[PDB]
């Protein structure tokens, strides 16, 4: 099972306001028009690789998808991150858990913390073991694919936990669609509007027109011939 990322999964790269400007950052982003693996809650929660980092999304009824586990082998040999939502409340732990044969939220803890229309979106980065979580939530009309569109994900948390993650898994409301994409180090040109929200982006490695847009630091390109790169 697979679906297309489209232009989903850009996020604010740093804690800075910018406005009416185009800023070319390079960071771990979900590549434009890449595939994302597609799974179900019911009618399929195996461990997945984490690689350099994850984009995770869900189109769902309401709060069927509820959390995630991150670690190496999920079997108490080292610390392992757990993130949970119950009713209104976010809950987080990192203990050396031995997880169940099939973990669900049924209807040595070095860090712990608390705080048919739904698209959840998230990005998880673990550079130098610092677990950075970005997110967005939006209304949607149908719950069985990613929508073609754009909205930038904003920061929620930075966990300074230092863990060497290689795998992850989701947690869900057993007594409905979720999607996974992988980040890569890419130059993106980001359009910050008048109000300092990112409203559009160009993946500068997607196609030659996107190299041209990024060579010019511009989303409009006038007629011409542009020396965008040198190949070898």
């Amino acid at each position: 099972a697979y679906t297309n990322s489209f232009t989903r999964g850009v996020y604010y790269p740093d804690k800075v306001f910018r406005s009416s400007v185009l800023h070319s950052t390079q960071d771990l982003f979900l590549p434009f028009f890449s595939n994302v693996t597609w799974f179900h809650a019911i009618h399929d929660n195996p461990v997945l690789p984490f690689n350099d980092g994850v984009y995770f999304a869900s189109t769902e009824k309401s709060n069927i998808i509820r959390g995630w586990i991150f670690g190496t082998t999920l079997d108490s040999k080292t610390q392992s991150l757990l993130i949970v939502n119950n009713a209104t409340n976010v809950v987080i732990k990192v203990c050396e858990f031995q997880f169940c044969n099939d973990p669900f939220l049924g209807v040595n803890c070095t860090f712990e913390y608390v705080s048919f229309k739904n698209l959840r979106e998230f990005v998880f980065k673990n550079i130098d073991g610092y677990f950075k979580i970005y997110s967005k939530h939006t209304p949607i009309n149908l719950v069985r694919d990613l929508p073609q569109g754009f909205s930038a994900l904003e920061p929620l948390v930075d966990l300074p936990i230092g863990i060497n993650i290689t795998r992850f898994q989701t947690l869900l409301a057993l007594h409905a669609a979720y999607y996974v994409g992988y980040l890569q180090p890419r130059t993106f040109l980001l359009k910050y509007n008048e109000n300092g929200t990112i409203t559009d982006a160009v993946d500068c490695a997607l196609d030659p027109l996107s190299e041209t847009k990024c060579t010019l630091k511009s989303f409009t390109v006038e007629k011409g011939i542009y020396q965008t790169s040198n190949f070898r």
Partner: antibody
Amino acid sequence: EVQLVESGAEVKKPGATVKISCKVSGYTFTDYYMHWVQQAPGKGLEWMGLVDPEDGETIYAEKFQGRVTITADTSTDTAYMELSSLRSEDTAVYYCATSSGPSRLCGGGSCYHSFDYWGQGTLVTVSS
Amino acid sequence: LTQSPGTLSLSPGERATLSCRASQSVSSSYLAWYQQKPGQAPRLLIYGASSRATGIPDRFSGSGSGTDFTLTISRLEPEDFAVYYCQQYGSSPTWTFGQGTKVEIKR
């Protein structure tokens, strides 16, 4: 592989009501949205509405609003549609279809809406 | 949706080009093309404005830019005596068909 198997052809007066159905096979019936689509004789197609076969959530096209109704059942793997207070222009082919294969089984590897599969086309006649 | 021509034909082994057009009230990559031999139910040929359905011949091809979206049929065959429809979709749910083009081989 996948099969959508519709009702027989049907006949009614103007101001009456007709019912159409579609039994489904070869994929897990809940997992692909169910759709109804209409086609006047030799004409371009038009969409009538959709339902989720997992949950019964249904929405309708403007041109057939109030006249149409749709439902589906997971025990019989089957979809059903009604068209009500008929006119001669409702003489048409009618189709069940699906749109949202998570794997588009025997049709594509990475998916983007569109329609996955269609039934054989139920014929309807409306006349005095 | 606008679609043209109303009907099109040329010799076998040649090309036929169809266009589908609208205001941006419906979305660019959510565009697909369907073949119908008269009396059969329609069949998906192109999706993503440009990909092929599995097992459909490599001589069928879609492309588009901005407001204008196209099917080109190439190496024309007797199989191509069919009505071809675009459809286009958007975030606000509207599974919307084109006017349809009746394709033929020249005789």
